[PDB]
Amino acid sequence: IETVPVKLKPGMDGPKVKQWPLTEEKIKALVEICTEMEKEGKISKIGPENPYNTPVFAIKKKDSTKWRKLVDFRELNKRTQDFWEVQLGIPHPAGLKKKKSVTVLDVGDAYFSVPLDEDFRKYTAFTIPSINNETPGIRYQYNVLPQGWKGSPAIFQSSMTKILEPFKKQNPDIVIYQYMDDLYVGSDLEIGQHRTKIEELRQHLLRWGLTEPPFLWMGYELHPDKWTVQPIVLPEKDSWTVNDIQKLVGKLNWASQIYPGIKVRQLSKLLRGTKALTEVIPLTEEAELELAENREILKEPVHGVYYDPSKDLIAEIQKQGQGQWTYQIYQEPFKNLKTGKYARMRGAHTNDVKQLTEAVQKITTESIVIWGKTPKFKLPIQKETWETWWTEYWQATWIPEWEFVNTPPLVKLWYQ
Amino acid sequence: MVPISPIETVPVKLKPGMDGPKVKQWPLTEEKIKALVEICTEMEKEGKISKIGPENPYNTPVFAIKKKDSTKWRKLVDFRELNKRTQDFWEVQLGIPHPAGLKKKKSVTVLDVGDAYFSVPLDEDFRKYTAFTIPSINNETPGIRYQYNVLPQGWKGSPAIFQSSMTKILEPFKKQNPDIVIYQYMDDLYVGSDLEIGQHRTKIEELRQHLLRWGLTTPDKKHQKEPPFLWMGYELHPDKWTVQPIVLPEKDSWTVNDIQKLVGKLNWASQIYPGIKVRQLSKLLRGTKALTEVIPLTEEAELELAENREILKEPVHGVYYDPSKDLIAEIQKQGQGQWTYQIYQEPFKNLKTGKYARMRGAHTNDVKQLTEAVQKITTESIVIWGKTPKFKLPIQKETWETWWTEYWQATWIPEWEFVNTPPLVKLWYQLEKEPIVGAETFYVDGAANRETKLGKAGYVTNKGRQKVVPLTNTTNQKTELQAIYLALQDSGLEVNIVTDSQYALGIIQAQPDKSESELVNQIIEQLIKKEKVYLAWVPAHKGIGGNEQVDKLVSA
Numbered sequence: 001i002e003t004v005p006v007k008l009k010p011g012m013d014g015p016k017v018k019q020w021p022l023t024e025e026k027i028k029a030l031v032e033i034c035t036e037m038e039k040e041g042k043i044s045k046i047g048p049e050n051p052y053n054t055p056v057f058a059i060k061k062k063d064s065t066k067w068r069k070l071v072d073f074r075e076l077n078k079r080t081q082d083f084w085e086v087q088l089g090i091p092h093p094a095g096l097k098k099k100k101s102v103t104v105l106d107v108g109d110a111y112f113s114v115p116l117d118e119d120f121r122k123y124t125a126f127t128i129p130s131i132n133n134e135t136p137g138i139r140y141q142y143n144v145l146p147q148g149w150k151g152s153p154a155i156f157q158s159s160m161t162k163i164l165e166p167f168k169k170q171n172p173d174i175v176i177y178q179y180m181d182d183l184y185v186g187s188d189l190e191i192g193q194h195r196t197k198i199e200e201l202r203q204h205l206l207r208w209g210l211t212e213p214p215f216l217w218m219g220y221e222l223h224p225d226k227w228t229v230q231p232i233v234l235p236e237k238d239s240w241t242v243n244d245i246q247k248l249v250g251k252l253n254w255a256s257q258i259y260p261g262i263k264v265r266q267l268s269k270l271l272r273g274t275k276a277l278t279e280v281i282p283l284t285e286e287a288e289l290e291l292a293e294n295r296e297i298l299k300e301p302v303h304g305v306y307y308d309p310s311k312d313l314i315a316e317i318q319k320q321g322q323g324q325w326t327y328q329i330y331q332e333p334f335k336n337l338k339t340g341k342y343a344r345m346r347g348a349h350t351n352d353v354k355q356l357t358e359a360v361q362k363i364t365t366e367s368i369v370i371w372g373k374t375p376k377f378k379l380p381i382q383k384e385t386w387e388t389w390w391t392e393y394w395q396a397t398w399i400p401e402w403e404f405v406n407t408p409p410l411v412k413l414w415y416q
Numbered sequence: 417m418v419p420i421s422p423i424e425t426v427p428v429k430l431k432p433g434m435d436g437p438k439v440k441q442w443p444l445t446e447e448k449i450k451a452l453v454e455i456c457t458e459m460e461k462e463g464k465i466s467k468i469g470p471e472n473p474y475n476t477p478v479f480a481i482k483k484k485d486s487t488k489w490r491k492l493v494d495f496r497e498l499n500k501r502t503q504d505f506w507e508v509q510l511g512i513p514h515p516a517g518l519k520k521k522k523s524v525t526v527l528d529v530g531d532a533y534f535s536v537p538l539d540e541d542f543r544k545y546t547a548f549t550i551p552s553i554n555n556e557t558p559g560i561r562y563q564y565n566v567l568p569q570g571w572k573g574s575p576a577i578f579q580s581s582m583t584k585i586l587e588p589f590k591k592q593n594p595d596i597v598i599y600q601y602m603d604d605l606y607v608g609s610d611l612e613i614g615q616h617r618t619k620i621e622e623l624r625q626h627l628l629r630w631g632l633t634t635p636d637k638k639h640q641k642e643p644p645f646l647w648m649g650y651e652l653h654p655d656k657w658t659v660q661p662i663v664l665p666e667k668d669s670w671t672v673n674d675i676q677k678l679v680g681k682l683n684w685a686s687q688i689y690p691g692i693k694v695r696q697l698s699k700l701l702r703g704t705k706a707l708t709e710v711i712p713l714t715e716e717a718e719l720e721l722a723e724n725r726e727i728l729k730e731p732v733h734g735v736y737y738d739p740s741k742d743l744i745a746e747i748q749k750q751g752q753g754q755w756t757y758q759i760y761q762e763p764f765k766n767l768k769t770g771k772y773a774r775m776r777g778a779h780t781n782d783v784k785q786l787t788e789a790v791q792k793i794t795t796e797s798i799v800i801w802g803k804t805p806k807f808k809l810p811i812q813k814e815t816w817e818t819w820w821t822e823y824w825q826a827t828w829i830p831e832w833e834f835v836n837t838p839p840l841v842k843l844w845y846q847l848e849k850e851p852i853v854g855a856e857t858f859y860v861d862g863a864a865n866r867e868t869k870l871g872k873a874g875y876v877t878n879k880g881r882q883k884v885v886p887l888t889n890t891t892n893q894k895t896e897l898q899a900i901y902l903a904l905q906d907s908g909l910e911v912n913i914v915t916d917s918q919y920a921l922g923i924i925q926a927q928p929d930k931s932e933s934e935l936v937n938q939i940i941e942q943l944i945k946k947e948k949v950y951l952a953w954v955p956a957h958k959g960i961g962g963n964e965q966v967d968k969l970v971s972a
């Protein structure tokens with residue numbers, strides 16, 4: 001009921017980020033949403049003495065038909081002070097990624113019940129553009145904690161801890177983790193029981209609410225205990241061609257950068273001479289042993305891999321074709337913290353960019369569950385193509401950072 | 417008296433840490449001072465400025481300027497210093513409408529709102545920063561001190577605050593009259609509609625009555641301005657638009673500046689004149705920026721200019737947007753990285769045109785450039801019409817399918833259909849996915865000395881064919897490309913090539929069809945002639961047979 005003071009980081013002004021072009025349907029959706037938000041006191045019109053801006057657009061959440069406003073507060077979040085006053089930071093729960101089922105709830109609607117510091121409101125300014133700039137864009141700022149702003153869960157945390165208290169005490173084995181507008185709820189129950197607990201959980205928020213959230217009813221189900229990883233595997237063959245052995249030596253040479261003890265001497269010796277690529281080469285005993293020893297090395301964990309919470313996570317993605325995508329998450333090169341592969345890219349069989357956008361969201365979700373922050377993506381796409389289309393397929397309430405890769409990596413061959 | 421509503425004041429601040437201006441008033445002639453006193457006396461009578469006491473420490477210089485071919489002086493208050501110290505504002509006008517996105521109107525009326533401007537008050541707390549001083553006759557009395565009560569012409573905040581103030585006043589009128597459009601530019605309101613003229617005039621009178629609620633009057637004697645309108649470099653008519661006349665000058669010789677102006681005009685023309693080209697003229701401007709230098713036009717530039725004169729020989733117009741119809745965008749390849757497009761709804765009735773130029777860089781291909789043009793047109797179309805056009809592209813559906821399924825990057829183009837208008841965009845070569853049975857295998861390598869730039873490139877094959885060429889003025893990376901070129905030259909129509917150059921593989925795997933490097937172009941020319949090419953990579957210095965053999969031949 002009383003506001004928490006907020007400031008920007010020393011020597012920084014507010015965000016001044018251009019609104020990107022919006023389609024007619026998204027503008028109309030935003031005009032309706034913001035008209036209601038204004039009637040409810042959540043936002044207010046602003047005048048020309050506020051020069052700040054943050055981009056806004058609209059999405060449809062997964063399995064819903066109603067438009068959701070999404071503000072891209074990435075710039076404001078970078079510029080906003082850090083929040084360690086009451087707590088140094090909420091230790092990320094290592095048990096969340098170990099639960100049989102995790103359901104993600106959209107609790108962002110809760111933030112609108114808390115007023116925002118009057119002196120900070122100007123920095124949340126945003127614009128609803130008009131088609132062809134024919135009318136002045138509609139300018140608003142927030143009066144309440146905004147969805148997507150890193151300060152909202154931090155300021156709401158004391159309220160959240162009290163709302164959830166009876167449920168946690170009543171269910172001591174449930175793991176509950178908040179990230180931005182998301183609540184991640186993990187348990188080891190049979191799914192039917194699990195959903196009932198999730199539905200039990202919704203009622204606490206609803207009961208609290210009335211003392212109606214548009215997307216609280218929804219539920220994104222995950223199963224992190226079944227999440228799958230990608231060790232390095234070598235072919236098992238009866239007939240090795242010159243080409244096969246060259247590819248193997250290439251892959252082993254690459255793996256030698258990650259694992260020590262990798263040898264290719266005996267395998268390369270097989271290719272002595274100047275041979276046809278399609279010629280079949282019988283493996284010698286020495287080459288078979290060296291291969292077997294390499295296989296044994298690749299079954300072991302990478303040495304000296306640790307997570308440092310002070311460093312960025314980096315995610316690389318490769319297009320493998322036929323709807324398949326590989327990815328790696330690391331902080332230091334050759335020190336992967338997780339690797340993975342998708343082929344299940346939903347409703348996007350003829351759209352590369354929709355597939356990549358869904359891959360980006362899935363990887364970010366995995367990274368939030370495991371480490372409690374989002375990675376910086378290295379995307380195999382031209383900037384202009386990505387920036388034209390990704391908002392059409394985005395369904396999450398957060399947005400990670402990304403950069404673009406313009407030269408094809410050899411590494412695609414080694415994760416293939 | 418009829419009560420009028422006040423205009424809400426916009427609160428204004430100086431930039432953090434900055435104080436107001438303290439600039440010396442210049443001495444003036446007795447004649448100039450007398451002129452400024454009379455002018456300021458009238459502004460004071462009208463409420464625009466007020467005399468202030470000696471306590472105010474701020475000052476901005478004031479000047480008197482002779483209104484040409486007249487005996488009347490004008491005042492100029494030079495707010496440059498205050499402007500440096502005044503906060504930034506939201507500037508609503510940054511993005512201007514494109515004519516191609518406007519809708520046809522039966523009637524467009526212009527209302528002069530210059531007088532309303534002086535009903536917009538300046539934030540009371542900011543007024544002190546606008547202080548200025550008329551020097552006194554002979555410097556024998558204190559100068560007359562004034563500050564502004566209204567938005568000063570020339571002050572940083574005036575355009576944004578005026579525009580926002582008018583918009584807020586007009587909002588209920590626009591909202592409750594959805595059958596008109598209202599656009600403000602400078603001191604005029606433009607009101608358009610499709611009503612029969614009697615009803616349209618009724619709406620204008622209703623707007624005037626609405627504006628009177630805030631005491632804002634407009635000139636009864638209707639404006640002298642009427643369609644067509646000259647606006648932002650365009651001509652607007654009720655049912656069509658074009659650019660203002662494009663006149664390319666005749667010259668016996670051309671300077672740097674002349675060519676910059678020519679390309680500027682051509683770029684501007686290219687939004688409605690189809691097929692404008694600027695590559696060869698822009699090539700003349702590479703790297704140098706001495707505006708007076710005379711650059712001889714190349715034969716190619718003279719040809720491009722002649723082609724442009726023919727395109728511009730007579731007027732072309734665009735039509736306006738009909739939201740009930742689809743948008744169609746058609747693209748053609750023009751050569752040398754140039755692309756041209758038209759956007760229309762009905763055949764042969766363009767809304768606008770445009771062009772796209774290849775981005776600068778080492779290598780490219782036509783499919784990538786076509787994709788880039790599509791993305792540019794898509795984004796422009798979202799801006800102008802709020803939707804993506806349906807595309808008509810000079811690329812076969814099967815060509816696109818082969819490209820995107822095999823390309824290492826994610827790529828997408830929205831709904832489109834093939835249009836068979838040459839030259840068509842095609843794939844010029846396709847590398848094999850697997851080694852070729854029965855094709856000779858060429859192991860290539862290169863090396864160069866970093867000091868002398870002497871080097872070697874060559875190959876060895878499984879048939880015992882070999883070649884090493886000594887080279888001058890080369891580098892390690894270049895020799896790797898030269899070695900691949902040799903292998904392509906000396907092999908049959910199907911060939912397996914083994915390289916240890918990650919660099920060379922990275923270039924060829926990017927699938928360029930044209931390059932800034934003549935060597936890469938020669939390689940591309942060779943690839944096009946082959947039936948099948950498999951390019952395999954191996955790590956150097958790992959004891960791989962053929963690779964180690966050729967490495968020894970070129971590194972000695």
Ligand SMILES: Cc1cc(/C=C/C#N)cc(C)c1Nc1ccnc(Nc2ccc(C#N)cc2)n1
Pocket residue numbers: 134513517518519520521524597598599601606607608643644645646647652653654655
């Ligand atoms: C942007 C704009 C510039 C001017 C003009 C500024 C100036 N000078 C006048 C108006 C009324 C508008 N606003 C809109 C909005 C939607 N459709 C149109 N169509 C439209 C406008 C003018 C003519 C004409 N003649 C025909 C159609 N105009």
Ligand SMILES: COC(=O)c1c(N)c2cccnc2n(O)c1=O
Pocket residue numbers: 861862863896916917918956957967971
């Ligand atoms: C002593 O030689 C070398 O270390 C050597 C390289 N580092 C090398 C790197 C890329 C491509 N080709 C290469 N070749 O051919 C080499 O010989």
Ligand SMILES: [Mg+2]
Pocket residue numbers: 861862896916917956
């Ligand atoms: Mg080499």
Ligand SMILES: [Mg+2]
Pocket residue numbers: 861862863956967971
């Ligand atoms: Mg070598």
